[PDB]
Structure 1
Amino acid sequence: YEEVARKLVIIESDLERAEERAELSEGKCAELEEELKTVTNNLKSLEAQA
Structure 2
Amino acid sequence: EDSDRKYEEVARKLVILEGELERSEERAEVAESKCGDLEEELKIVTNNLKSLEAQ
Bigger shift: residues 18-27 or 7-16: 7-16
Is 1:29 aligned to 2:35, yes or no? yes
What number of residue pairs does the alignment pair up?
Answer: 49
TM-score (norm 2): 0.69
Q: Which runs of 5+ in 2 are unaligned?
A: 1-6
TM-score (norm 1): 0.74
% identical equivalent positions? 78
Which residue of 2 is the match for residue 7 of structure 1? Answer: 13
Q: Which runs of 5+ in 1 are unaligned?
A: none
Per the alignment, in what secondary structure is the counterpart of residue 32 of structure 1?
Answer: helix
Q: CA deviation at 1:2?
A: 2.7
Q: CA deviation at 1:35?
A: 0.6
How big is the alpha-carbon RMSD for the aligned residues of Structure 1 and Structure 2? 1.5
